[PDB]
Subunit: 121 residues, 4 copies
């Protein structure tokens, strides 16, 4: 029920129309190519070779797709989530974000194409 | 309803328990790191810079995840398929395969973790 | 998903654990046999021949299954709802209720078995 | 996936476009009013008070909704089936049928409105 693009250079991330409510089961699929600065591109799992120098999400590689649900901290998405249920006390609008160091989004390029849907529960 | 791994060095691929029937809607999500020979690894979209020297799937990069449905030709999966329906006359077990040149799977390493489910239809 | 029973004699109805949120798609199936007083029994559509003498739901027959979502007005359920979205902006817990005139639940008998699930959206 | 009507007077029943395949989960909801001969009408559970005089389905009341899957024996549907899986070795097109005595469908009237969908598995 949501399809769109998340730009690697967008520090604020892309607000979706999906409101995660308690008990919701969701599926995410992410595709595409992006860079956090170097003259190469990576998919939605990012670059396993790059050290973490203050990423917004310590549980995903630099250049990975991550998300926030309302005011949650960052949650790894990577290539996507299969029939996934959030931790207790997590709810609200899903924001998709490119995993980088705050203040370093200006040299980023490319984007991921993302589908999000609610599953049966 | 199927969860598993597909080994990059398995030329025959991983035959799943999912039988695709006409009208079925499926979702696939793939994650992980694999190599077609080099010391680097790539995610399930593969290596966008490697030329095609006789890949089993010409519509996906070397080192991408692809599939067959029964005895179909290869179909790109990459990071996954969101609520996907097959063409007419495509039916049978889903086989997941690492995209490489026939005869060259021996120097491959790593695997993709894959979830497949049938959706509402 | 929720499975349970609503008694025809319960003016307060049965509060379920299903929270209807905006955009939710739900499926309900209701079965069983109940009476609003007469010696006969009706299924969850109720008695199409009995006049409305002040039913809690004017859009369903006497002895039908109806519901509230949070503090909404009554909504007909009857035998159930197939991949149903609320026509109004309503939200909150689903309460199931037997459709009868307030203060006349004392001569009611029987019950409906009800399954509620959220569908893909 | 399928929405339509089954006439009470149709002895052959109504063939749907739903092919039940092994492993499939289905949901059916049925509504409406029909008769096996009397002036009164009943919902999809039929008439609890009418004796079985050789019904096509001995496990449902006269005037109930029943079905066959391919050439299976009759299976009770009544008001519907919630996330239901068939017994082993039952496969093929779903035919919906009004439960009556063979040869006695000529005096029947009305119809049930029926929705069938495949659920997640
Ligand atoms: O923008 C940054 C810091 C520098 C990234 C970079 C490293 C090597 C070559 C070019 C750029 N992090 O996201
Ligand atoms: O209880 C009522 C009013 C009376 C309905 C009734 C009619 C004939 C025989 C017994 C009861 N409304 O639900
Ligand atoms: Ca950067
Ligand atoms: Ca190789
Ligand atoms: Ca009453
Ligand atoms: Ca008859």
């Amino acid at each position: 029920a949501w399809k769109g693009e998340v730009l690697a250079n967008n520090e604020a991330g892309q607000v979706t129309s999906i409101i995660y409510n308690p008990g919701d089961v969701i599926t995410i699929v992410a595709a595409g190519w992006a860079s956090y600065g170097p003259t190469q591109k990576w998919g939605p799992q990012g670059d396993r070779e790059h050290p973490d120098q203050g990423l917004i999400c310590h549980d995903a590689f630099c250049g990975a797709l991550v998300m926030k649900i309302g005011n949650s901290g960052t949650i790894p998405v990577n290539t996507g989530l299969f029939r996934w249920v959030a931790p207790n006390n997590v709810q609200g609008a899903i924001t998709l974000i490119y995993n980088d160091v705050p203040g370093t989004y200006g040299n980023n390029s490319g984007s991921f194409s993302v589908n999000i849907g609610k599953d049966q529960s």
